[PDB]
């Protein structure tokens, strides 16, 4: 089956959190393998506690490891920006299995504002020639995690071939977003130009290229 | 030391069975009290278990999964492989090697692997079209220009693109992936250069697709 860990769970910039795992009597109640693991994007598990209580090596002593019957529980005092993760319960079963929770996605929240960077892209040579057009627009380090971005042919708005990515978290712990125009070298020629308006936190960062 | 890298297809039809297999370095997989296993997660999912097999070599697996799971190993190349078989999307996931430090003691997984993608889909693969973009520094720091390869059309992840063959890594950003109403993925990579180098440096994208075989080196010269 599967251990039952909240989808979420957001914390102070400071300090404490507690994330609970849920089993039964014939895996978290009989045996203490509970072993927890932090994820971060894009990266694969990292071992953070075992046998219920074991911290692992190099681990700090703000990450607690409790259990009360069948759930087990994860404690972090006083969070960092590295601990912006999603989290993972897991336990031995009967007879030599393994079994991992739902996983609970770490949120810090008193993190400062960050505005957007925006960069803008004409079609290459390469792809009008290629009878194709597409307008690159990139926007990376921004916090929080959400953006609206509106195309402009001169001043005029544009909604068809637009695809706009979700704001996924960087390495840094800000949040990246592409959006891509799609248009024909015929369109990108009758025009003056087009631009990239980003919309973040009430400001706007605008960039424009021409033909 | 202890060292895992998955093998496997990035694209499976299905009706095919997947031959994933995890090779072991800086340690012996026949040896102590060590335990390998399987772990999946999809897309953005939660991890699941696959199942074991330990130094002794006998293997125990997930019992929902167990049907159409048949582990193996091979102690002479130092390597484990999974073999699963009447595959549905469901089993689209990034695929995981993992090692049990101690088997007398307990379940933890202390050393992973940095995980293979695999994608069930009736769904050809499409090689990226490379386009080049050229710098100016309109939204950028003085001094500083912005270029970077467009990664287009692909099926399916991932692309994985570096510049001048690994040489060049400071301010390299390689955006997540756009899945467009196509079906087809899109991305880029970005470096920020100082403008001084543009008239000197030559720079070059590497692009890899492994599913669909393409390799593609653009070099991205101002216009």
């Known amino acids: 089956s599967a251990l039952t860990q909240p989808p979420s769970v957001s914390g102070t910039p400071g300090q404490s959190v507690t994330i609970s795992c849920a089993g039964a009597?014939?895996?978290?109640?009989?045996?203490?393998?509970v072993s927890w693991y932090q994820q971060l994007p894009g990266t694969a598990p990292k071992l953070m506690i075992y046998?219920?209580?074991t911290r692992a090596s190099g681990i700090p002593d703000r990450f607690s490891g409790s259990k009360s019957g069948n759930t087990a529980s994860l404690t972090i005092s006083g969070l960092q920006a590295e601990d912006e993760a999603d989290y993972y319960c897991?336990?031995?079963?009967?007879?030599?299995?393994?079994?991992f929770g739902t996983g609970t996605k770490l949120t810090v929240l008193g993190q400062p504002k960050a505005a957007p960077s925006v960069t803008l892209f004409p079609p290459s040579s390469e792809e009008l020639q290629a009878n194709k057009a597409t307008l690159v627009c990139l926007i990376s380090d921004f916090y929080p995690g959400a953006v609206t971005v509106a195309w402009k042919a001169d001043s005029s708005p544009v909604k068809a071939g637009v695809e706009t990515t979700t704001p996924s978290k960087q390495s840094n712990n800000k949040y990246a977003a592409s959006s891509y125009l799609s248009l024909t070298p015929e369109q990108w020629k009758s025009h003056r130009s087009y631009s990239c308006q980003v919309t973040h936190e009430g400001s706007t960062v605008e960039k424009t290229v021409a033909p | 030391q202890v060292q895992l890298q998955e093998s496997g297809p990035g694209l499976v039809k299905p009706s095919q069975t997947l031959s994933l297999t995890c090779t072991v370095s800086?340690?012996?997989?026949?040896?102590?009290?060590?335990?390998w296993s399987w772990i999946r997660q999809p897309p953005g999912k939660g991890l699941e278990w696959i199942g074991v097999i330990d130094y002794d070599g006998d293997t125990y697996y997930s019992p929902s999964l167990k049907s159409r799971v048949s582990i193996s190993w091979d102690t002479s190349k130092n390597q484990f492989s999974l073999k699963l078989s009447s595959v549905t999307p469901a089993d689209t996931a990034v695929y995981y090697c993992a090692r049990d430090p101690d088997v007398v003691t307990g379940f933890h997984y202390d050393y992973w692997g940095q995980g293979t993608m695999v994608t069930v889909s009736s769904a050809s693969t499409k090689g990226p079209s490379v386009f080049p973009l050229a710098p100016s520094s309109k939204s950028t720091s003085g001094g500083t220009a912005a270029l970077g390869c467009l990664v287009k059309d692909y099926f399916p992840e991932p692309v994985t693109v570096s510049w001048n063959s690994g040489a060049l890594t400071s301010g390299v950003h390689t955006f997540p992936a756009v899945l467009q109403s196509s079906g087809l993925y899109s991305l880029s990579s970005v470096v920020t250069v100082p403008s001084s180098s543009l008239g000197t440096q030559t720079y070059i994208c590497n692009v890899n697709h492994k599913p669909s075989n393409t390799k593609v080196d653009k070099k991205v010269e101002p216009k």
């Open positions: 800086g340690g012996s997989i026949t040896s102590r009290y060590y335990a």
């Open positions: 009597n014939n895996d978290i109640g009989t045996y203490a393998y």
């Open positions: 046998k219920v209580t």
């Open positions: 897991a336990s031995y079963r009967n007879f030599n299995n393994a079994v």
